[PDB]
Paper text:
After the controlled degradation of RelB by Lon protease, [name] is able to bind the ribosome and specifically cleave messenger RNA ([name]) in the A site (Christensen and Gerdes, 2003; Christensen et al., 2001; Galvani et al., 2001; Li et al., 2009; Pedersen et al., 2003). [name] [name] is an 11.2 kDa protein consisting of a compact, four-stranded antiparallel β sheet flanked by three α helices. [name] occupies the A site and causes cleavage of [name] after the second nucleotide of the codon by reorienting and activating the [name] for 2′-OH-induced hydrolysis.
Under these conditions, RelEwt cleaves the unmodified [name] inside the ribosome, and complexes representing the uncleaved (2′-O-methyl [name] + RelER45A/R81A) and cleaved (unmodified [name] + RelEwt) states were subsequently crystallized in space group P212121 with two ribosomes per asymmetric unit (Selmer et al., 2006). In the precleavage structure, two nucleotides downstream of the A-site codon are visible in the electron density, and their position is consistent with the general path of [name] through the 30S subunit (Yusupova et al., 2006). This rearrangement is critical as it helps to orient the [name] optimally for catalysis. The reorientation of the nucleotides is stabilized by stacking of the base at position 2 (A20) with a conserved tyrosine ([name] Y87) and the base at position 3 (G21) with C1054 of 16S rRNA. This conformation would be difficult to achieve with a large purine base and could contribute to the subtle preference for pyrimidines at the first position.
Residue numbers in the entry:
A (entry chain A7): 1 to 47
B (entry chain AD): 2 to 272
Write the structure that this text describes.
RNA sequence: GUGAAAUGCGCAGAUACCGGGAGGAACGCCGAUGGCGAAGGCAGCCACCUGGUCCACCCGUGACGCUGAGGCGCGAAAGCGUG
RNA sequence: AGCCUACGGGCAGGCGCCGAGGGUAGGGCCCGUGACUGGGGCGAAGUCGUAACAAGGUAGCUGUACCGGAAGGUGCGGCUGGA
RNA sequence: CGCGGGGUGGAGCAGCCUGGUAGCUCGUCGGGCUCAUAACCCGAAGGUCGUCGGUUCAAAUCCGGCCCCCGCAACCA
RNA sequence: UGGAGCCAUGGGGGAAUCUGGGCGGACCACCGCCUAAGGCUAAGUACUCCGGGUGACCGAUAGCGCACCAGUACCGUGAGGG
RNA sequence: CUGGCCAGGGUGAAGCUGGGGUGAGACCCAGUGGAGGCCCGAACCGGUGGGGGAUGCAAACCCCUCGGAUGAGCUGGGGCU
RNA sequence: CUACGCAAUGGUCGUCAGCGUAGGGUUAGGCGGGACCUAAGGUGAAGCCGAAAGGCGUAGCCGAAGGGCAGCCGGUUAAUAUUCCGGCCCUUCCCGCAGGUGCGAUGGGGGGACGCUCUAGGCUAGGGGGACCGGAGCCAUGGACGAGCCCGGCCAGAAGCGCAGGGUGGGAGGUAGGCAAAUCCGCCUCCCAACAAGCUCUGCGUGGUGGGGAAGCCCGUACGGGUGACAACCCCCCGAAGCCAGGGAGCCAAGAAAAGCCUCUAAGCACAACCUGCGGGAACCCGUACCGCAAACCGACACAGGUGGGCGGGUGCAAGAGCACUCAGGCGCGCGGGAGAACCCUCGCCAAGGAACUCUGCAAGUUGGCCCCGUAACUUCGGGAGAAGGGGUGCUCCCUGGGGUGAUGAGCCCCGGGGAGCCGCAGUGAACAGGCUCUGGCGACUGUUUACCAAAAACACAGCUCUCUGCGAACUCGUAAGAGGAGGUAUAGGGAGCGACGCUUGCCCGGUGCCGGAAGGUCAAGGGGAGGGGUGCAAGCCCCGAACCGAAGCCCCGGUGAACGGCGGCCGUAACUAUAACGGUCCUAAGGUAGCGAAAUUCCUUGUCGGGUAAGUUCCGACCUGCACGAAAAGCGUAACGACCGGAGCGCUGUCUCGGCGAGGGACCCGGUGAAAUUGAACUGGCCGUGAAGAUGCGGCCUACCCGUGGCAGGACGAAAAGACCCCGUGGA
RNA sequence: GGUUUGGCACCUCGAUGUCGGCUCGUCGCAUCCUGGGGCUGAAGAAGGUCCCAAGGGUUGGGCUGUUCGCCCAUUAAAGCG
């Protein structure tokens, strides 16, 4: 039956995207954690 | 009159509709004034703040003139009476000689071709508007203002109307639709006559939808919910409140008066 | 308030009196063994729409009349439905 | 395919329509009977009150309406077959 | 059977806790009023206080034992 | 909350300029301390991404999660896990 | 907020039109018409009963059967809590 | 896509591949996005709010499967094509020339611009015929040289033409309005014109002309290449849900915005400028492979699941996107080969019986389409109705009535009516395809729900009542600003209960709640200070502190039931007996009315009678000592409706007496690949008995050669899950 | 005796599935039939009661989830554990 994951590029960018992370102070901190941790992607990879 | 239906289907055995002869000559609104994109949505910034709203036929908003002192002395011919999805009452589209057109909440009796105007001078005949003070005590009027120059706010629902009881200073005494006796400023405008389409109270929606077409979602009873949801909720197998009728929010709902006690707005009421 | 009482109302200021206001129903005297209507029934005053009926003149039609199963309408009060 | 023929034809025979009646199904009218139940009639003994007839001790009566152990009471209008 | 209320003239209730006093309405008996019965009026009689014991100077009354009456509760498998 | 002063102050009231005014644990009186409602000021102190030096520190299931192309593979929508 | 979708049948409301009827009416006939959380039934939505499956094809599935199917209908995309 | 490959990936194999290595491959002014518009919403100048972070928010800006905008038919590649090429046809910008005109906005107006259902007239897409046109060929196996059989008879196309439609009155005056600036809109007044014409804008046909063009045969790995003919390219018929489109009619629930685009004028500028022509130039950025109901997407997998839009041919069947077969096209599901056990699944048939099965006809059967007769109680007159129950149904020939298109006549399609007759067991001959009835309970009804054990009598529902709310409404969200309510205004909005409709909905304001009461009682801070204290030589500075004045709340007084709620006990009494209309007494705030009643409620209980059965703890009808109905947590009914729960019949059955046979997929044998939970170790028998009281493992006795394979499930207190019950914990929620 | 209702709380709560039916049984005898037998208030036929003896038998339905009962129709009997 219909599962949870229903891929949608626009949806993903708008939601977890870098620009989005940057607006909210919470999102900013995400980036801060990820960078400080040394992640190779601060944001979900999408094209 | 209210149209009735032979029961060729249940729900349509009780369903009754309005008598649309009144409106006639004009179905499509005035692309001029009227045309105003109306916003739907049953709630504010996020959360819903009025339960059970939503759905219901698309709806365009007719922009009516609730303050007639705009064009004092300038008369207008009642061009037509048309349907309006945003209110119980019907509306009358009128062309002023001025050339300008507006929408007035169509009073009972008013007819096409008939002429109307608003001002102190104005003749006391159904359709004209004048500051209450210049209106014969006793006559019935609708679309009344509460405070001068603030717009009509009283008696506008289909078939409603207020009556002038008497004067007393710069104030005139009105008996509002609810039966309340309130002192209203003499300068407040009011248009002579009663609202109209008074058969409105006589329509029987008929089915469960219809109620839906009017954008009214189903209303679920308290006792039917669970303790978390409502004070009446809970209890094994059907039950009686548990004392004393309350709302989902905790306040009593059978009798408890609610208007602000110390509101200055009193000292002007008596009913 | 009654036969007499009590219930009840009233010192939170009633009853009794004056002034103002709201509202609903009914129309005192005239008024009668009176009038009108087919019956039920109809009473302040004003206007509008309207039925019946009586008198006078012998003008006109020329038996065109009477009753009336059924049908149709009206029909006190109480009662019923929507407001 | 039979039998007779005066070789046209007739007869037996075969097929079909109709058909007494039998069958299935669903209706109409009438009769009988049924746990229990409604009201009725008559009662030489019971229980309860007293509604009505004399202002019958609240004039009676009446259509209707609500109520009451019961008769009945009360409201609305009506009658006189009461004053 | 486990908690608790209850048996008082013929009927129905007081009196018991704050032990020495049996009260109330009805009924029953006597007498009036009426022609007579009710109704009304006047006057009386009637109670082992369920039962056997216990405390006390004295027990309907306070304490226990069964005898009956009424009301709760008899849950989770 | 105590006998509750001292320091700060949201509300109300509301002075004085050295005969001024605060404090010395309620409050008075003595005796004494100090000058509120403007501001700045090294050093001694803290920490360790980074560089170096040591180690009765580990020695590839230990030591950092990672000695190795590891915050990777992979998992999760995601934060995150790893 | 903005788009899309719903085979084919069936029943035959109101209105009209004509006739009848009456003082006028109400009303009554046909014909026309094509209403409805109407009927049967695909797509589409659903999940009634039974069987199967139970280290499954499947962390809810398959077959048969069944409900809705112009509506309080189903559905894509864009949003909000 | 291609060339090399096969370790691994592929549930087997593998030379193959969606796999490995490598090289190619995606071409646009017109297709889709962006150098256009606005929707919800987001963001956000001003502005408001907030301890910080941050929350609001007019304009503006962003934001699209919506609006707007110029490409059709063919040809080529191993792999792209409305993109390259060919033919035909367009769009913007810039410049120049000519001819026109008050040109000119971010502003004004118009327009864009709109629902649902049903629909007219024309077309087109698409499809079926043809004696006609063009074709290679073919007469087999008894017959046919035949109007034979077989294959194909189109596409695109500017101007101009026609055929259908769509939009729209033309004038001249005034003018308080369009936040007047207007020659434009808008209103008035009056010559003209009118179920039009004219002017425009679409669609369709035609059009110079340009493409395409089979079956079969020959070559051929692949993919296709000549063939093919100078191919023909015509006539009828059916015909859209698509086009003309902004068409028409009806209806109530009353159906986006903005730009492009017309037009009006403002500043400005008129040697500007726009407008129409005609030339010559200029025209960017991103996407374009391939998969795309699936082995390439979401499901850990090449997973029987899930995934939006369009096309989706033919014959037949009443119709159809249904069903059966079938084109084009695509597939045979990435383990096979044998056997012919039990048993399992899915499937077919069955003597006699026909529910006896069983909790239950669960399951399966029966019935099934269409046409025609013909249909009951009851009813809210719609319905119940497909009630029931019957008959017809194929093929052949004769006769005959209407329609559409043609032309009134011919073929071609579309509905019919009447006669004769033929063959089978059977004519909706296969596939799709209701079993029916009677009678109860609940709920009025369509609808909604526990995604994944409940679809219901639960929720919702129209409708009824109560109650709050006079508008900066009440109420909800928020610290606030603000927002919803509502651009609504008591015929409205919130809250509550009941739950279509019919007939109704009694009595009790003692207690609780809410409503009303300018008096009293009590009552905090604060006001007030009689009077008292600590200190000082003191003036003083400090403390406590009674009277009395002091809100709401509570007390108190009164109301209120579709407010929370409640609605009696014991004795006696009437011709046999029963029973008690009546009476007595205690108590209460008042003692349950109508109507129902062993009920979705009745313990005793399978109550007692009736009914239905041969037999009936259920069911239906009654009675009423209702453990423990009862009026809006409604009461009693009710046509219709229901995959709801009960009881009966008829029909028919493998449910059953009672089982038998047959089929296919497994099971079994061979070849290939090859798991799992579980597992103290094992050399793991029966009976009595013993033992922590249920022993393969102790005792005694008995039985027993070693090892497997197909089967069955009594035991290993078999597996699984640190029992969901129970108690415990001074555990949790 | 160990089939009822219990009492006790000994193994089992890191699980010993708890009524009824169906299927398949097997055993006990305190025997329901059938076979032997003694008394009898046993004339006969039919019974009563006790003794021996399970070898084999020990029906089909209505009702209820029922076990059990009651009932219909039979039977040699419609046994209890
Ligand atoms: Mg996943
Ligand atoms: Mg997207
Ligand atoms: Mg890197
Ligand atoms: Mg917002
Ligand atoms: Mg509700
Ligand atoms: Mg619930
Ligand atoms: Mg509450
Ligand atoms: Mg609560
Ligand atoms: Mg209950
Ligand atoms: Mg409750
Ligand atoms: Mg007169
Ligand atoms: Mg004459
Ligand atoms: Mg009358
Ligand atoms: Mg009356
Ligand atoms: Mg009444
Ligand atoms: Mg009335
Ligand atoms: Mg016959
Ligand atoms: Mg009878
Ligand atoms: Mg009798
Ligand atoms: Mg009397
Ligand atoms: Mg009398
Ligand atoms: Mg009397
Ligand atoms: Mg009367
Ligand atoms: Mg009375
Ligand atoms: Mg009277
Ligand atoms: Mg006594
Ligand atoms: Mg006496
Ligand atoms: Mg006497
Ligand atoms: Mg419990
Ligand atoms: Mg301060
Ligand atoms: Mg201060
Ligand atoms: Mg100085
Ligand atoms: Mg200080
Ligand atoms: Mg100080
Ligand atoms: Mg000090
Ligand atoms: Mg100090
Ligand atoms: Mg100091
Ligand atoms: Mg300083
Ligand atoms: Mg300083
Ligand atoms: Mg500093
Ligand atoms: Mg510093
Ligand atoms: Mg350091
Ligand atoms: Mg390590
Ligand atoms: Mg090592
Ligand atoms: Mg993942
Ligand atoms: Mg990932
Ligand atoms: Mg009609
Ligand atoms: Mg329907
Ligand atoms: Mg259907
Ligand atoms: Mg489709
Ligand atoms: Mg779906
Ligand atoms: Mg669902
Ligand atoms: Mg499905
Ligand atoms: Mg299912
Ligand atoms: Mg289910
Ligand atoms: Mg299943
Ligand atoms: Mg199953
Ligand atoms: Mg199984
Ligand atoms: Mg079906
Ligand atoms: Mg279906
Ligand atoms: Mg959607
Ligand atoms: Mg989305
Ligand atoms: Mg190769
Ligand atoms: Mg392999
Ligand atoms: Mg490759
Ligand atoms: Mg650029
Ligand atoms: Mg843009
Ligand atoms: Mg924009
Ligand atoms: Mg916006
Ligand atoms: Mg914001
Ligand atoms: Mg904005
Ligand atoms: Mg777009
Ligand atoms: Mg577009
Ligand atoms: Mg390709
Ligand atoms: Mg080209
Ligand atoms: Mg111009
Ligand atoms: Mg506009
Ligand atoms: Mg031959
Ligand atoms: Mg053809
Ligand atoms: Mg052409
Ligand atoms: Mg059409
Ligand atoms: Mg714009
Ligand atoms: Mg492609
Ligand atoms: Mg699929
Ligand atoms: Mg598809
Ligand atoms: Mg596969
Ligand atoms: Mg798949
Ligand atoms: Mg789909
Ligand atoms: Mg067809
Ligand atoms: Mg068909
Ligand atoms: Mg099919
Ligand atoms: Mg093929
Ligand atoms: Mg058989
Ligand atoms: Mg047979
Ligand atoms: Mg049979
Ligand atoms: Mg049976
Ligand atoms: Mg049985
Ligand atoms: Mg079945
Ligand atoms: Mg039915
Ligand atoms: Mg044939
Ligand atoms: Mg045609
Ligand atoms: Mg069929
Ligand atoms: Mg059918
Ligand atoms: Mg029942
Ligand atoms: Mg329902
Ligand atoms: Mg579920
Ligand atoms: Mg259902
Ligand atoms: Mg109702
Ligand atoms: Mg606040
Ligand atoms: Mg609004
Ligand atoms: Mg409401
Ligand atoms: Mg309301
Ligand atoms: Mg309810
Ligand atoms: Mg009563
Ligand atoms: Mg009260
Ligand atoms: Mg009360
Ligand atoms: Mg009271
Ligand atoms: Mg109060
Ligand atoms: Mg004080
Ligand atoms: Mg002193
Ligand atoms: Mg007070
Ligand atoms: Mg006696
Ligand atoms: Mg006697
Ligand atoms: Mg007697
Ligand atoms: Mg009761
Ligand atoms: Mg009763
Ligand atoms: Mg019974
Ligand atoms: Mg009960
Ligand atoms: Mg019972
Ligand atoms: Mg029972
Ligand atoms: Mg019987
Ligand atoms: Mg039976
Ligand atoms: Mg019986
Ligand atoms: Mg049965
Ligand atoms: Mg019954
Ligand atoms: Mg109840
Ligand atoms: Mg009540
Ligand atoms: Mg109630
Ligand atoms: Mg109900
Ligand atoms: Mg009922
Ligand atoms: Mg349903
Ligand atoms: Mg159902
Ligand atoms: Mg049934
Ligand atoms: Mg087989
Ligand atoms: Mg093998
Ligand atoms: Mg043992
Ligand atoms: Mg050993
Ligand atoms: Mg042993
Ligand atoms: Mg074995
Ligand atoms: Mg097995
Ligand atoms: Mg086992
Ligand atoms: Mg186990
Ligand atoms: Mg445990
Ligand atoms: Mg919690
Ligand atoms: Mg035992
Ligand atoms: Mg035991
Ligand atoms: Mg012990
Ligand atoms: Mg256990
Ligand atoms: Mg274990
Ligand atoms: Mg023996
Ligand atoms: Mg013998």
């Amino acid at each position: 039956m219909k599962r949870t994951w229903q891929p949608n590029r626009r949806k993903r960018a708008k939601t977890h995207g870098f620009r989005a992370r940057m607006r909210t102070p919470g999102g900013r901190k995400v980036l801060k954690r990820r960078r400080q941790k040394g992640r190779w992607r601060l944001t979900p990879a999408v094209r | 009159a209210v149209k009735k239906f032979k029961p060729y289907t249940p729900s349509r055995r009780f369903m009754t509709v309005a008598d649309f002869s009144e409106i006639t000559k004009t179905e499509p609104e005035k692309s001029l004034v009227k045309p105003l994109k109306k916003t739907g949505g049953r709630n504010n910034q996020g959360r819903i703040t009025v339960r059970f709203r939503g759905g219901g036929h698309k709806r365009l908003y007719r922009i009516i003139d609730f303050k007639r002192w705009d064009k004092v002395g300038i008369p207008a011919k009642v061009a037509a009476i048309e349907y309006d999805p945003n209110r119980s009452a019907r509306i009358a589209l009128l062309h002023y000689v001025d050339g300008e057109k507006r929408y007035i909440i169509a009073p009972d009796g008013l007819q096409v071709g008939q002429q109307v105007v608003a001002g102190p001078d104005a003749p006391i005949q159904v359709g004209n508007a004048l500051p209450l003070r210049f209106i014969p005590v006793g006559t019935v009027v609708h679309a009344v203002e509460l405070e001068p120059k603030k717009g009509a706010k009283l008696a506008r629902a289909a078939g409603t109307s207020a009556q002038i009881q008497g004067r007393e200073g710069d104030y005139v005494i009105l008996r509002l639709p609810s039966g309340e006796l309130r002192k209203v400023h003499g300068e407040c405008y009011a248009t002579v006559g009663a609202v109209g389409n008074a058969d409105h109270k006589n329509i029987v929606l008929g089915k469960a939808g219809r109620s839906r077409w009017l954008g009214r979602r189903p209303h679920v009873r308290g006792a039917a919910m669970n303790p978390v949801d409502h004070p009446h909720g809970g209890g094994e197998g059907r039950a009686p409140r548990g004392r004393p009728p309350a709302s989902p929010w905790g306040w009593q709902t059978k009798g408890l008066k609610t208007r602000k006690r110390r509101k200055p707005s009193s000292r002007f009421i008596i009913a």
